[PDB]
Amino acid sequence: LDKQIKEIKEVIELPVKHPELFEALGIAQPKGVLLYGPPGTGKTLLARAVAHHTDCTFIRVSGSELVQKFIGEGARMVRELFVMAREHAPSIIFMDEIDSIGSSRLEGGSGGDSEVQRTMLELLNQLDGFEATKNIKVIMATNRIDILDSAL
Amino acid sequence: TRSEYDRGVNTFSPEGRLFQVEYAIEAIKLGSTAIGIQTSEGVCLAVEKRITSPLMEPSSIEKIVEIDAHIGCAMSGLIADAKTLIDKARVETQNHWFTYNETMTVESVTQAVSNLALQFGEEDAAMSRPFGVALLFGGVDEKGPQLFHMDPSGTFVQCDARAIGSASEGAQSSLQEVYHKSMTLKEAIKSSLIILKQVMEEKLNATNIELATVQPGQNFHMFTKEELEEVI
Amino acid sequence: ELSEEDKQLQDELEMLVERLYRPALEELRRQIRSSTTSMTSVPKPLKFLRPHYGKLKEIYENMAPGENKRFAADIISVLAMTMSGERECLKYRLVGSQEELASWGHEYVRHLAGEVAKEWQELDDAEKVQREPLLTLVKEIVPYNMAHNAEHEACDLLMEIEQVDMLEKDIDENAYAKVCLYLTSCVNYVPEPENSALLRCALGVFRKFSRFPEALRLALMLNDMELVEDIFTSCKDVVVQKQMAFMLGRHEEYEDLTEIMSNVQLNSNFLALARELDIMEPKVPDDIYKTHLEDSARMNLASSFVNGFVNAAFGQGNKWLYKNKDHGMLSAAASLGMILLWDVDGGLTQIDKYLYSSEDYIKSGALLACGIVNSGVRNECDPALALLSDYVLHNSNTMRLGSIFGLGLAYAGSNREDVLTLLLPVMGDSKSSMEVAGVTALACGMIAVGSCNGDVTSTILQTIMEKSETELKDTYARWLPLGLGLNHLGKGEAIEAILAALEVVSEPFRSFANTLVDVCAYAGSGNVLKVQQLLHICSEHFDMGAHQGVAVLGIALIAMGEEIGAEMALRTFGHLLRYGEPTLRRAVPLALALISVSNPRLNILDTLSKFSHDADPEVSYNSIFAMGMVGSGTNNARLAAMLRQLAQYHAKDPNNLFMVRLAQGLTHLGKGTLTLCPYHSDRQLMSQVAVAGLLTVLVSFLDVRNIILGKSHYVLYGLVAAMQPRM
Amino acid sequence: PIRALDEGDIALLKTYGQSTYSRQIKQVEDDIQQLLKKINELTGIKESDTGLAPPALWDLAADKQTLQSEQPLQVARCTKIINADSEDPKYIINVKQFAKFVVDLSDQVAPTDIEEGMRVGVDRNKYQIHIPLPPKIDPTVTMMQVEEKPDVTYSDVGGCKEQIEKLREVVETPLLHPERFVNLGIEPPKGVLLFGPPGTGKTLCARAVANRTDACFIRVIGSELVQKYVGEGARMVRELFEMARTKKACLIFFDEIDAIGGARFDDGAGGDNEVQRTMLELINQLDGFDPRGNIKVLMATNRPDTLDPALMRPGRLDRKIEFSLPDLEGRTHIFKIHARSMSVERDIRFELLARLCPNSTGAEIRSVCTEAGMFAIRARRKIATEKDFLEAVNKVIKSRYMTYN
Amino acid sequence: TKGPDAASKLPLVTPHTQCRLKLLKLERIKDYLLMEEEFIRNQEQMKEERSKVDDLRGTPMSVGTLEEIIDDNHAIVSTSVGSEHYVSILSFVDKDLLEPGCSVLLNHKVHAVIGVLMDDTDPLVTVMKVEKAPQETYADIGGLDNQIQEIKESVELPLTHPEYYEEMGIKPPKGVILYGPPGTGKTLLAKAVANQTSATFLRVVGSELIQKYLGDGPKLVRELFRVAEEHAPSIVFIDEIDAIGTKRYDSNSGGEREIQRTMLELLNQLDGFDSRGDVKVIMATNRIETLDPALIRPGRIDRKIEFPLPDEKTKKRIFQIHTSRMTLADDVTLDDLIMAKDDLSGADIKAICTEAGLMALRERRMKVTNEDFKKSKENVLYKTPEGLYL
Numbered sequence A: 001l002d003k004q005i006k007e008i009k010e011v012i013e014l015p016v017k018h019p020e021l022f023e024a025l026g027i028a029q030p031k032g033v034l035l036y037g038p039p040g041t042g043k044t045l046l047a048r049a050v051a052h053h054t055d056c057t058f059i060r061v062s063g064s065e066l067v068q069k070f071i072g073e074g075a076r077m078v079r080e081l082f083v084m085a086r087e088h089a090p091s092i093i094f095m096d097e098i099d100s101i102g103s104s105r106l107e108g109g110s111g112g113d114s115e116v117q118r119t120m121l122e123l124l125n126q127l128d129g130f131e132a133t134k135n136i137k138v139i140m141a142t143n144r145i146d147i148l149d150s151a152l
Numbered sequence B: 001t002r003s004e005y006d007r008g009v010n011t012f013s014p015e016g017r018l019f020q021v022e023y024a025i026e027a028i029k030l031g032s033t034a035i036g037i038q039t040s041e042g043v044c045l046a047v048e049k050r051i052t053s054p055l056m057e058p059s060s061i062e063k064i065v066e067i068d069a070h071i072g073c074a075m076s077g078l079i080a081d082a083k084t085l086i087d088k089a090r091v092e093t094q095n096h097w098f099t100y101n102e103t104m105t106v107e108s109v110t111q112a113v114s115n116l117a118l119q120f121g122e123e124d125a126a127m128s129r130p131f132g133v134a135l136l137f138g139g140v141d142e143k144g145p146q147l148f149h150m151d152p153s154g155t156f157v158q159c160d161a162r163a164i165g166s167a168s169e170g171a172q173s174s175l176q177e178v179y180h181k182s183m184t185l186k187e188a189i190k191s192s193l194i195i196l197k198q199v200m201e202e203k204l205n206a207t208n209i210e211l212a213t214v215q216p217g218q219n220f221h222m223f224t225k226e227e228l229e230e231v232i
Numbered sequence C: 001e002l003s004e005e006d007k008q009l010q011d012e013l014e015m016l017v018e019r020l021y022r023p024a025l026e027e028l029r030r031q032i033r034s035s036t037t038s039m040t041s042v043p044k045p046l047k048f049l050r051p052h053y054g055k056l057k058e059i060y061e062n063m064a065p066g067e068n069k070r071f072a073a074d075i076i077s078v079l080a081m082t083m084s085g086e087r088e089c090l091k092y093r094l095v096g097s098q099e100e101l102a103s104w105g106h107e108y109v110r111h112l113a114g115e116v117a118k119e120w121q122e123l124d125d126a127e128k129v130q131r132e133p134l135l136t137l138v139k140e141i142v143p144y145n146m147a148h149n150a151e152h153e154a155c156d157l158l159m160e161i162e163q164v165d166m167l168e169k170d171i172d173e174n175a176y177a178k179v180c181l182y183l184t185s186c187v188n189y190v191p192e193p194e195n196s197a198l199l200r201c202a203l204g205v206f207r208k209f210s211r212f213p214e215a216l217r218l219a220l221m222l223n224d225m226e227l228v229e230d231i232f233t234s235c236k237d238v239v240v241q242k243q244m245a246f247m248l249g250r251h252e253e254y255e256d257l258t259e260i261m262s263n264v265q266l267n268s269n270f271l272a273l274a275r276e277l278d279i280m281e282p283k284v285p286d287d288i289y290k291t292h293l294e295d296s297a298r299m300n301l302a303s304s305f306v307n308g309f310v311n312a313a314f315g316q317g318n319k320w321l322y323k324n325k326d327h328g329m330l331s332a333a334a335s336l337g338m339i340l341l342w343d344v345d346g347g348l349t350q351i352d353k354y355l356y357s358s359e360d361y362i363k364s365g366a367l368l369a370c371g372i373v374n375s376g377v378r379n380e381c382d383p384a385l386a387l388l389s390d391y392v393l394h395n396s397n398t399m400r401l402g403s404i405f406g407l408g409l410a411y412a413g414s415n416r417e418d419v420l421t422l423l424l425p426v427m428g429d430s431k432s433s434m435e436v437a438g439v440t441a442l443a444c445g446m447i448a449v450g451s452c453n454g455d456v457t458s459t460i461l462q463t464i465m466e467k468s469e470t471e472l473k474d475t476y477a478r479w480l481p482l483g484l485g486l487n488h489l490g491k492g493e494a495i496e497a498i499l500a501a502l503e504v505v506s507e508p509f510r511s512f513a514n515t516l517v518d519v520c521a522y523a524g525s526g527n528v529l530k531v532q533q534l535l536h537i538c539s540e541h542f543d544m545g546a547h548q549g550v551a552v553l554g555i556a557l558i559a560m561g562e563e564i565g566a567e568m569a570l571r572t573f574g575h576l577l578r579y580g581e582p583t584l585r586r587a588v589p590l591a592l593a594l595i596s597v598s599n600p601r602l603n604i605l606d607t608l609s610k611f612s613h614d615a616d617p618e619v620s621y622n623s624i625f626a627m628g629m630v631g632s633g634t635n636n637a638r639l640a641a642m643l644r645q646l647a648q649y650h651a652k653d654p655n656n657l658f659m660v661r662l663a664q665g666l667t668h669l670g671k672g673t674l675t676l677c678p679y680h681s682d683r684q685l686m687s688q689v690a691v692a693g694l695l696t697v698l699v700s701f702l703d704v705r706n707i708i709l710g711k712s713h714y715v716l717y718g719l720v721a722a723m724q725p726r727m
Numbered sequence D: 001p002i003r004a005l006d007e008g009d010i011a012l013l014k015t016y017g018q019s020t021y022s023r024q025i026k027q028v029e030d031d032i033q034q035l036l037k038k039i040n041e042l043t044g045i046k047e048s049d050t051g052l053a054p055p056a057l058w059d060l061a062a063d064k065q066t067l068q069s070e071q072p073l074q075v076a077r078c079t080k081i082i083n084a085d086s087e088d089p090k091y092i093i094n095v096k097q098f099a100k101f102v103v104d105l106s107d108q109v110a111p112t113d114i115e116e117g118m119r120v121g122v123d124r125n126k127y128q129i130h131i132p133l134p135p136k137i138d139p140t141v142t143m144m145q146v147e148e149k150p151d152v153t154y155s156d157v158g159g160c161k162e163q164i165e166k167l168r169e170v171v172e173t174p175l176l177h178p179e180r181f182v183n184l185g186i187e188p189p190k191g192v193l194l195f196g197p198p199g200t201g202k203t204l205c206a207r208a209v210a211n212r213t214d215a216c217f218i219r220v221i222g223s224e225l226v227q228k229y230v231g232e233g234a235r236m237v238r239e240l241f242e243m244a245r246t247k248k249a250c251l252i253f254f255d256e257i258d259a260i261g262g263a264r265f266d267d268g269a270g271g272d273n274e275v276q277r278t279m280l281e282l283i284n285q286l287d288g289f290d291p292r293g294n295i296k297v298l299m300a301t302n303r304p305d306t307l308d309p310a311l312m313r314p315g316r317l318d319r320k321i322e323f324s325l326p327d328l329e330g331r332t333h334i335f336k337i338h339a340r341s342m343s344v345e346r347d348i349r350f351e352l353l354a355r356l357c358p359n360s361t362g363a364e365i366r367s368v369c370t371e372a373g374m375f376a377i378r379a380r381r382k383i384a385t386e387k388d389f390l391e392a393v394n395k396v397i398k399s400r401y402m403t404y405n
Numbered sequence E: 001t002k003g004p005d006a007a008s009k010l011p012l013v014t015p016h017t018q019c020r021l022k023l024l025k026l027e028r029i030k031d032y033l034l035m036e037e038e039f040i041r042n043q044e045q046m047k048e049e050r051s052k053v054d055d056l057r058g059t060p061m062s063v064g065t066l067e068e069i070i071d072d073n074h075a076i077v078s079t080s081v082g083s084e085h086y087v088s089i090l091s092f093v094d095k096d097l098l099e100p101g102c103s104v105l106l107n108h109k110v111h112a113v114i115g116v117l118m119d120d121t122d123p124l125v126t127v128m129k130v131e132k133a134p135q136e137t138y139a140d141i142g143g144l145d146n147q148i149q150e151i152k153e154s155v156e157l158p159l160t161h162p163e164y165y166e167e168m169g170i171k172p173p174k175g176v177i178l179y180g181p182p183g184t185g186k187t188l189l190a191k192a193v194a195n196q197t198s199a200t201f202l203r204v205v206g207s208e209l210i211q212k213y214l215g216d217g218p219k220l221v222r223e224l225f226r227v228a229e230e231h232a233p234s235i236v237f238i239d240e241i242d243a244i245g246t247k248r249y250d251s252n253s254g255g256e257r258e259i260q261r262t263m264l265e266l267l268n269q270l271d272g273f274d275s276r277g278d279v280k281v282i283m284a285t286n287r288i289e290t291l292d293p294a295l296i297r298p299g300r301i302d303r304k305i306e307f308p309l310p311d312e313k314t315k316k317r318i319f320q321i322h323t324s325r326m327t328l329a330d331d332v333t334l335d336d337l338i339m340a341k342d343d344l345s346g347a348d349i350k351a352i353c354t355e356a357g358l359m360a361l362r363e364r365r366m367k368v369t370n371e372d373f374k375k376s377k378e379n380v381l382y383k384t385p386e387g388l389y390l
C-alpha cells in the first residue's frame, strides 16, 4: 500500500507540517480523505499508523457513535466534536464506516432514516460550510462507497 | 381521496363522477381558443394559432378542418384525438351521403361523432380513455345554419354562439354580451375577431388566426391570406 | 529516497569537490543546467553541494587569479543566494564576467534584484562609487524583466529607495498598461515627494508614447503650473486639445482655446444634459420634504436652503424674500442668485433689479448672487468685477461680509493679480470688523488655492500679528489660518518657516492655526507619520477642543485618497467618538462627511444615525449635517425616510428641525445633477476647486452653535461654491 | 514513480522559486492577524444595559428596602381552610413544586379576605400569611391575545366569496345581529376548519376577521402549547379557555394545529404523548360536560388528513371550509388587487393574465405581480406593462406542449 | 429593533498577484491598525455615589422571569426552581422595560427587582450569530451571473436602493432558495452576500433546529427569528434545509412529529398571522423535490434559484478563478477540460486545480503543466447503456 500511504501522507501530513508549499502554489488546502476497499485491506490500520505517526490531535468517531436515540442529539454531538477538534487543532478526525453515520439520502417522512440523515447533514456542513475550517483534517473509511452520499 | 376513484374510467366515485371524464374536459382547456358563431346568414369560425416560431408551416397546426362541403370543424385539444374524431366525422358524412344520397344534417353528424366518443371502455368495440378533444361543427343543414358543440364526454348541443379552449371562461362572457339573433356574417366575423384579440397574448395580425365560414350558398370557405389582411 | 542515478550524480559532485581546475570549472558550471532547466525547481546540485558550501567558500577565499577563480564564482554565488554569500561575492562573480543571466534563471534574476536592493538600503550617500556598477547592473537586468513580463518587479527596482527614469523611458511601446495603472496606484499610495517623482515618471512615459490624456490629469497631481503649460504646449492635435481644454476648465485656433478653458459654454453643456432626462421644475419645499406623509424665519431659511440646493443653476423672488426677521438675512437672495448660478445673461438683469432695492440684506445678497453665479465661468469681459471693486468699500459688516465672499465666488482658483490687489490692501481690517476680517481672509485664501502667494501669506501673517488678546479667543477669528491654509496646499515640508513664524502667537490660540495650516498642507496624498501626528494631537487629554476638532478634520482630509485608508479611518473615527470628549465627538461627523461626501455608504449612514439622537445638541447637529453631506447630490433612498423619522423624533426641537430639514435639502440637492465630491478626475485629484469650499464649510461647522446659530450663514453658499455637476 | 519531499528538497521548495519580498509580506500578514487579535482583546466588551436608571428618579437611603423584603408568596394558593375550626382558622397553602404547609395570619387586618383560593402572601421561614394577591394570568396566555389589529380587510381576500361569506356568517353574524338566529330557531355553529392547498388566503381571512371583529381574539401560538413538563400544555389549554370564558365573546384562532395533534396511535410515539394529551384537553374544552359559552373557533390546517377524528367531528368544528385554487374570475380579482398599488399602464389585460395562470394559488399571483415589478426595475423602466407581466408569469407559474393544440 | 449589527471587515487590498504594490497596501493596513491600537492604549492608559449604590446592589445578582408586575414598587418575579415571589422594586431601574416574560435581575438575599437584562438571547442562537466577515466577495463566483443578479435584487437592492420599489408600491422578495446538485456555489453566493451586506448575517443549519427536549425546537426557531427581527434588518441563511424540510407525513413516532413541529413553527415565523419585518431568508438544499409545499410556497420563499452544473463558459471562468493565484506553464491550455462534457462542478474544478498543483509538487516543481492537469482530473473525478439510443 505504498501509493496509498503516499497519497494519504500527502493530504494529511503535508498541509499541517508545511502549509507554505500550498500557499506558494496558490492551491486551496486539501481537506479530507476517504478509503475504499474490501474488508481486509487496511482502511483502519493505515489510520492507526497515521495516528501513531502524527504530531496532531488524533480523534476517532468510528461506528454508529453519532446515532443516538434522542432527537436533536446527533447534530449536537458532531458539532461539539468539531468544536473539540478546532480547540485542539491541528487535528485528524477518523471516521470508520461512514456509511453507517451518513449514506444515501433516501426519502423520509414515513420509512426514511431521517435522524441518521440529519447527522450526516450536520457532518457535511461542518466539514465544509459557512465559516469553514482551518487545519482540521478528516479521514473516512468505507467498505463499499456505492451508497455513500454525493454531497459527502 | 381521489386516489382509487379517479385512476379508472369505470370506477364510480362516492359523488357519482367520472373523474377521468372531468380530467379530459380539463385537457380540453389547454388548447388554442376557437369561437364559432351561427347567424341567419351562415356560420363563422375564428381560431387562434400558437405558432411557436417560423419554420413551422401554417398547414400543420390544423384548428379548422373542412367537414364535407357544408360543415367546418374547429378543434380544441389533443391533436391525435382530433384527427381520429375528424376522420370519424368525414367517413360518417360520406357514408350517409352514399347510402341516403343527401347531406347529413349537423345534428346527425355531431350525434355520431359523440357516439364514437361515448365508448370509453365498453367491452363491445377500441379506446380506454375519453377522446380528449372538444369540437365545434359549424354547418348549413335544412334548418338553416347551425352550430353544434361536442365535449369529450359525448355530449353535444346546439349553440348560437360558442367559444372553446384555453380562452373559454374568458370569452363566453364576451359572447354573452355581444351576440344577438339578428346578426349578419360580417358582424359575426368582426365580433369573433374582437373577442379573439381580447383574449390573445400575441397581437392578432393575420398569421396568428384562422377564419372560415360555411354559408347557405358557397361552400365552406377558408379565408386566404389577402382576406385575412382585409378583415384585420 | 536518493534514487541510484541521483546518488551517482551526488557521488560525481563529491569527487568534483574532493579533487586540474579547468575541468572542475567546466563541469561545475555546466551543472547549473539544473537551474537553467525550463521545467524544474529544487536544482539538485543546489542542496547537493550543501555540505561542501563551507569548503567552496574557504577555497574561494584562498583562491587567486588564473585559470580558476573565474567561473567558480558563479557556483559560489548560486550556492550563496541559496544560503548566505551576499553581494560582495555576487559582484565578485559578476566581475567574473557573467552578468548576462541567460545561463541562469528567472529565480536568480529576482534574487539578484533583491540583493542589489538590500545593499542599496544598507549603503548611504557615501561609497557612491559602488552604485555606478550597480546602476549598470540594474540597466542590464531591466531589459530581461521587460522580456519576461516581470513588469511589477522592474517597477519595483525602479521605485526602490529612489526614482528612476531610464527604464520607463526604455519600456518599449503598446504594452504600457501596467506601467500606467500599476504605477498610478503606487503613486496614489507613496509617502514622500518621490510621489511627484513617480508622477512625472509616468508623465514622461505618456509623453514618449505620444498619448497623454492621462498626464493630462497627472498635471494637477504635479503641483507645477509650469508643467501644466509644458503639457499644454505640444498639443499637436486640436481634437485632443479640445478635450484637454474642457478638462482644465472643469478643474493654433486661439479663438476657442481660452473660451473652453474659461468654460463660457459649460452652462450650455449642463443645460443640454439637463434637457437629457429633463427635471426642470420650479418646486415647493414640502415635495422635497413629505410633510403630507407625516411662518418662522427659521422655516423660511430652511425652505430657501433646500430649494436652492435642489434647483441650483437651473435659472429658476423679492416677494418671498421679504419675510425677514433679524436672522432673516441675505440667505434667500443668495438662494435666488444660486438658483440662477452660471446664468450671467439673466443674472445681470435680475441681480441689478434686486440690488436697486432695500437695505443691506438686499444688496449684500445681490453681490453674493453675482459672485456665486460667476463661480465656475470666466470671460475677458470680467463680470461683476466693477460692482465688487466700486461698491461697499466702507468699514462695516453685512456689506463687505457678503461682498468679499462674492468676489471669492467670482474668481476662486484663479490667482489673478488684479483681484489679489483688490483684496489684499482691503484685508486691513482692524479698522473694520472681526467677521469682516475673517471673510476677507476666506476670499483671499479661496482665490489663492494653494498658490503659495507670498503677498497673501504676508497679509494673513500681519493680520494675525495684529492681536487682541480677548478677541482672539472669543469666536469668529480663525479664517486668517483658513486663508493661510488655502494659500498653502500640499506643498510638502515647505511649511516649517510659516510654522516657526506663527509659533509667536499666544498658547491657548494658534493650536487651530497650526493644525489648520498643516491640514490644508499635505493632504489626500496620505502620510502615515502625518496622520500619526494628527491622531496624537487628538489623543492628548485636556481636563483645545477645537484643536482636536481641526485634528479630526485633518485626519479626514488626509485620508481622502486611498479607499483602504478611508475605511480604516472610518474605524478610527468610530473609536474616537466612542472613547472621545464632546469636542471630539462633534468633530467626528465632519471627518466622516469629508471621507464620504455624496457617496452614501450604509456603514457611515448607520454610524451617524446611531450617534444622532445624542444628549449634546451640537453632536446631534453635526451628525445630521454629516447625513446631509453623505447624501448630497444623490437623492439616495432611505436617507430621507430615516431622516424624517429623526425629524418626527425631534418634532419640537427648533434647531434640530432646521438642520435636519437642511440635511433633507442636501439629500435632494441638485436632483442628482451636482455632486460635492472632490477628486473630479480618475477620483485622483485633490481638486483645488471645491476643496476650499468644503474645507471652509467643515471648519465653520466645527462650531455650529456659535456661528451657524449666530449672525452668519454664508457657509452653505460656500458649500455651493464647492458644488459641481455630475453629468 | 512517486517521490516524497525530504531533507533539503522541502526547503528548496519555498526558498528557490520565491520573491525576495515574500517573507516580509508573510510576516506582516501574520502580525496584522495577531494585531487584530490584540485589538479585539483590548476592546470588544460592552457595558450592556442591566436596566440601570437615569438620575433624578432614584432613591437614596433605600435601606428600608433590604430591611423589609423577601416576601416568598406567589407560591401560596390556599386549598383547604381546614373548616376554620371557628376561631384560629389555621389556613393551608401549596407552594407548588416545593411543599404544602399549614399557616396562620400575621398583621393581616381582615382575616377573612383569603377566599380559600385567593393566592395569599407567605414568608420564608415561618410561612404566616401577609397579603393577598389577585388571580394568576400566565404571561403567555395574556400575550397570545392579539392586540394589534392586522392591516387587511374583507376587500383584499380576492377570489373567495363563498368561503368569506361562510366565515363571516359563523364568526360575525351571530355576534353582531343575534336576533335572526334566535328568531328562526337555529343555534349558530361554533367551529370552522379552514383547509385547502398550501397558500390560498387562509391566514389572510383570519387576519381580516381579526381586523373587523369587535370581540376577543386569541391567535394561539402553536409552539406555545408544546412545552416540557408533561401536563403544562394541557394546563395552557385550560387557562386559554378560562380566559375566553372570562371575556364576553371570544374568537380563538388555533393555527397550524397539525402540530398540536394528528392521530392518537402511539406505537413509538409513546414519548410524544404530551402533545396528544394537550390535544385531548383541547377536545374536552371545545365540547364536553360543560357549556363552552360565546367561544367560536376558526382552526386552520393545510393538511386536515392526519387530524384526529375526535377533533374533526362536527361537534367542535361545524363549518369545515375548503378554499379552492381560485377560478378565472377569482384570479382576475387577485391580480387586480395585487396590481392596484403598482405603477402599471392603464391597458393591461388582467383577464388575460388570469387565463395565463392556470390553477395558480393567490400566493403565486402575488409572486407574479412582484416579479413583473422586478423585471420592470431591472429593465430600468418606471412603468411595467403587460409584457412585463407575461415575463413574470413565465417565470413564476410554470417554474413542450406540441400535442395540445 | 435595536438596529443592524453586520460585521467588521478590514479593507481588501485590490492586488492579489504577489506585488510590491500589495506589500505597500498591506503595510498601509498595518500602520492604520497600529495607529488605532496606539490611540486605544495611550488614551485609556496615558489618559462615587453610583459606585456605592451599585455596591449596595447585590454582588451575585441572579436572574428571574418577571410575571404580573403589581403596584409601583412591588413586582412579582420568579426563579429557576419553579418558585416565584412578590419582590420589591428599587429606585435603580429605568422602569417601563419590565414586561411579562422579561428576564429580570434580582438580588441574591433580598430578592428584589434590581435589573432588567434586556439582552438575553439564547447561547444556541448567539453562537450562530455571524460577526466574522468571510473573504468570499462576488469575485470568486465564476459565472453564475443570473443567479447573482437575482440574489442581489432579493438581498441588496432593498437596502442600497429603497426607492425603486416604493416608486411603484411593489414590495421586495422575502425569501430565496438556492437548490441544486452537490457543489455549485449555493454557499458561496451566501458568503458573498455576507461580505457585501451591511446587514446582520445569521448562520442557520437545519440539523441545529432539532432539539432534544420536546418542544424546544419550536422555541429555538422563535428565538432565532425574534433575534433576527429585533437585532437587525438582517439575513438568515438556513443551510441544508433538507435537514428538517421533508414533506409532512402522518408519521407514527415522536421524533418525526417533533421535527414537523419545528417545521410548522418555521412556517409560522416566515408567514404567520402577524407580519414579518426586514428579515430576508436564504435557504439552501441539494434536493428541492423532497420539501413541503408549505415552505416552498411563494409567500415565504419568493424566489427559487437553480444552481445547474455550470455550463462551458462558466466552467472556463471557474478555472480562471481557481488558477489565477497559481504559477501556470505556458504549455497549459485550459480548454482540454472545458471541451469535454463530463459533469464538472465548481468544487470539482477547485479540486482539479489543487490536485494538479500537488502532482507538480510531487514532480518536484512549483508550476502546473498540461500533463499534471490531465492526471489531476483523472485521479479526482469520482464516478444509458451503450446502443440503447442511436
Ligand SMILES: Nc1ncnc2c1ncn2[C@@H]1O[C@H](COP(=O)(O)OP(=O)(O)OP(=O)(O)O)[C@@H](O)[C@H]1O
Pocket (backbone or CB within 6 Å): A001, A038, A039, A040, A041, A042, A043, A044, A045, A046, A096, A097, A141, A142, A143
Ligand atoms: N496491506 C496490509 N498490510 C498489513 N496488514 C494488513 C493489510 N491489509 C489488511 N491487514 C490486516 O488487517 C487488519 C487491519 O484491519 P483493517 O484496517 O483492514 O480493518 P478496517 O479498516 O476496520 O475494515 P472494515 O471496515 O472492513 O472492518 C490487521 O490484521 C492487518 O494486519
Ligand SMILES: Nc1ncnc2c1ncn2[C@@H]1O[C@H](COP(=O)(O)OP(=O)(O)OP(=O)(O)O)[C@@H](O)[C@H]1O
Pocket (backbone or CB within 6 Å): D156, D157, D158, D159, D160, D197, D198, D199, D200, D201, D202, D203, D204, D205, D302, D326, D334, D361, D362, D363, D366, E267, E271, E272, E294, E297, E299
Ligand atoms: N385568494 C386570495 N386572495 C387574496 N390574497 C391571496 C389569496 N391567496 C393567496 N393570497 C396572498 O397570499 C398571502 C396570504 O397567504 P396565507 O398566509 O393566507 O396562506 P395560507 O394558505 O394560510 O398558507 P400556509 O399553508 O402557509 O398556512 C398574501 O400575500 C395574500 O395576498
Ligand SMILES: Nc1ncnc2c1ncn2[C@@H]1O[C@H](COP(=O)(O)OP(=O)(O)OP(=O)(O)O)[C@@H](O)[C@H]1O
Pocket (backbone or CB within 6 Å): A124, A128, A129, A151, E140, E141, E142, E143, E144, E181, E182, E183, E184, E185, E186, E187, E188, E189, E239, E240, E284, E285, E318, E321, E346, E347, E350
Ligand atoms: N462559481 C463558483 N466559483 C468558484 N468556486 C465555486 C463556485 N461554485 C462553487 N464553488 C466552490 O464551492 C465550494 C463550496 O461549496 P458550495 O458552496 O459549492 O456547496 P453547495 O453544494 O452549493 O452547498 P452546501 O455547502 O450547503 O453543501 C467552494 O470550494 C468553491 O470552490
Ligand SMILES: [Mg+2]
Pocket (backbone or CB within 6 Å): A043, A044, A096, A097, A141
Ligand atoms: Mg474497518
Ligand SMILES: [Mg+2]
Pocket (backbone or CB within 6 Å): D202, D203, E271, E272
Ligand atoms: Mg398559514
Ligand SMILES: [Mg+2]
Pocket (backbone or CB within 6 Å): E184, E185, E186, E187, E188
Ligand atoms: Mg455551498
